[PDB]
Amino acid sequence: MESLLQHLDRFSELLAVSSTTYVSTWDPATVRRALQWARYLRHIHRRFGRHGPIRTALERRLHNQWRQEGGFGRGPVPGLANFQALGHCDVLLSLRLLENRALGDAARYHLVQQLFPGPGVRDADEETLQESLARLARRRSAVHMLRFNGYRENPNLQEDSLMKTQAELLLERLQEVGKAEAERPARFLSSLWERLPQNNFLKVIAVALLQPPLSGEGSQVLVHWLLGNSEVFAAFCRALPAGLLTLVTSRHPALSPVYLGLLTDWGQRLHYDLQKGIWVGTESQDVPWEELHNRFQSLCQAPPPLKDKVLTALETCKAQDGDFEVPGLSIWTDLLLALR
Amino acid sequence: WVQLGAQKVAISEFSRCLELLFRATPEEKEQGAAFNCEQGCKSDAALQQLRAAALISRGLEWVASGQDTKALQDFLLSVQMCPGNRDTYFHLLQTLKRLDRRDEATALWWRLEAQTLWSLPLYLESYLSWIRPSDRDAFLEE
């Protein structure tokens, strides 16, 4: 059990420095050593990978590695990602060493010779490294061809594939941090928020809230993050489509009352001009009438437990701004009328 | 309704006029379909004076309820529309002397003095005279 820690952590160091360009010292000995360690891990993954306390101990070492490094400072090194990455560590290693230009010429020949003998060991009982590498390029070229000859962005982001998958990478990556309990998902998602492109990110999160459960602690965590940090959630409602926020709401009622709160707060920074018969905002970024009609359009076009809520939240903000029953006074009269 | 004192149902009718002066034009004979008011009910003078009124009528009711922002909007709109009623400028400058005197007021004095009845129909003439105030010139000489 402790025999594997000293093996795996020194292998982790070796793997981390692999893609770093100090490769001059390396020889066939280093390559042989790497690949036999990797075969051993691949056999570990096979033998006593499932239903072990060894299993959970290895993950603790892994996830503690990935939090002590951070994604912060010295380098944002990927590393081998998780429990499944033990099974194909070899190949990660293989791919990275080839990218590495500092690879001395003798090592590259012996390497490639060891990766792809030929069909001299065509009869191989274990799937050797050679066959996985073919399989890769294949799926890989495969994914090219679908993407550019029959892929389309579904409009219902929920029923897209990229988004739907990136979500699942996020859910798995928080399921691990939850078990670990070292840092709260909050800190992770704060750092994310700085680091990666926001429009992309949000859609992921949006769709993540919807994916039916895989072990919904995942979804339950994201709502606490969002309701906790107001500023991001303001951009969310602003960035997405309407049907997306509709389904967000009917699933998670914790989002109904603050979302409605944001519309209330946008409607009350408009003004009418008489000469063009239209509500418009003062400031350039102020969600237009067009957009605001639509989202309430949707929210109403929803199941019964939200329709009543929202419709009552209209009659209340109407009466607060005078119960006129004629247009050109109460934004909210306007809307309620515009829904027939 | 104003003389019977009923802010609401009154400002119903000032807004309901104003919409039929904007999401309509009167000047629509595309078809010789009938007999018409030739004169009284086509004048662009009749229209820019009738607007200027309904907006003046409303701006008052907006001060009777205390929404000097809304009143300001509606008066500033009649001015921009029909600059030669001058009761328009009186109500706006009364509003400005309350709040934000100097710059706005003088800028509009100079405009009035730069500026210086044709066939208005009777129901409107009389109605303008009926609402209009006595110290109007008195206010414009301050």
UniProtKB/Swiss-Prot annotation, chain A:
Effect of L209R: Reduced monoubiquitination of FANCD2
Domain of life: Eukaryota
PANTHER family in UniProt: FANCONI ANEMIA GROUP F PROTEIN, FANCONI ANEMIA GROUP F PROTEIN FANCF
Effect of Y272A: Strongly reduced monoubiquitination of FANCD2
Protein name: Fanconi anemia group F protein
Subunit structure: Belongs to the multisubunit FA complex composed of FANCA, FANCB, FANCC, FANCE, FANCF, FANCG, FANCL/PHF9 and FANCM. The complex is not found in FA patients. In complex with FANCA, FANCG and FANCL, but not with FANCC, nor FANCE, interacts with HES1; this interaction may be essential for the stability and nuclear localization of FA core complex proteins.
Disease: Fanconi anemia complementation group F: A disorder affecting all bone marrow elements and resulting in anemia, leukopenia and thrombopenia. It is associated with cardiac, renal and limb malformations, dermal pigmentary changes, and a predisposition to the development of malignancies. At the cellular level it is associated with hypersensitivity to DNA-damaging agents, chromosomal instability (increased chromosome breakage) and defective DNA repair.
Biological-process GO terms, alphabetical: DNA damage response; interstrand cross-link repair
Primary location recorded for the protein, binned into one broad class: nucleus
Substitution effect: V326A: Strongly reduced monoubiquitination of FANCD2
Function as written in the Swiss-Prot or TrEMBL entry: DNA repair protein that may operate in a postreplication repair or a cell cycle checkpoint function. May be implicated in interstrand DNA cross-link repair and in the maintenance of normal chromosome stability.
Impact reported for F324A: Strongly reduced monoubiquitination of FANCD2
DNA damage keyword on record: yes
Location(s), subcellular: Nucleus
UniProtKB/Swiss-Prot annotation, chain B:
Outcome of mutating G84R: No effect on HES1-, nor FANCA-binding
Molecular function, one GO term: damaged DNA binding
Keywords: Cytoplasm, Disease variant, DNA damage, DNA repair, Fanconi anemia, Nucleus, Phosphoprotein, Repeat, TPR repeat
Annotated localization: Nucleus; Cytoplasm
Keyword Membrane: no
A GO biological-process term: ovarian follicle development
UniProt KW Phosphoprotein keyword: yes
Tissue-specific expression: Highly expressed in testis and thymus. Found in lymphoblasts.
GO annotations of cellular component type: chromatin; cytosol; Fanconi anaemia nuclear complex; mitochondrion; nuclear speck; nucleoplasm
Start-end of each TPR repeat: 1-24, 52-85
Disorder: Fanconi anemia complementation group G: A disorder affecting all bone marrow elements and resulting in anemia, leukopenia and thrombopenia. It is associated with cardiac, renal and limb malformations, dermal pigmentary changes, and a predisposition to the development of malignancies. At the cellular level it is associated with hypersensitivity to DNA-damaging agents, chromosomal instability (increased chromosome breakage) and defective DNA repair.
Quaternary context: Belongs to the multisubunit FA complex composed of FANCA, FANCB, FANCC, FANCE, FANCF, FANCG, FANCL/PHF9 and FANCM. The complex is not found in FA patients. In complex with FANCF, FANCA and FANCL, but not with FANCC, nor FANCE, interacts with HES1; this interaction may be essential for the stability and nuclear localization of FA core complex proteins. The complex with FANCC and FANCG may also include EIF2AK2 and HSP70.
Described purpose of this protein according to its UniProt entry: DNA repair protein that may operate in a postreplication repair or a cell cycle checkpoint function. May be implicated in interstrand DNA cross-link repair and in the maintenance of normal chromosome stability. Candidate tumor suppressor gene.
Identification of the protein by name: Fanconi anemia group G protein
Whole-protein coverage range: 463 to 611 of 622
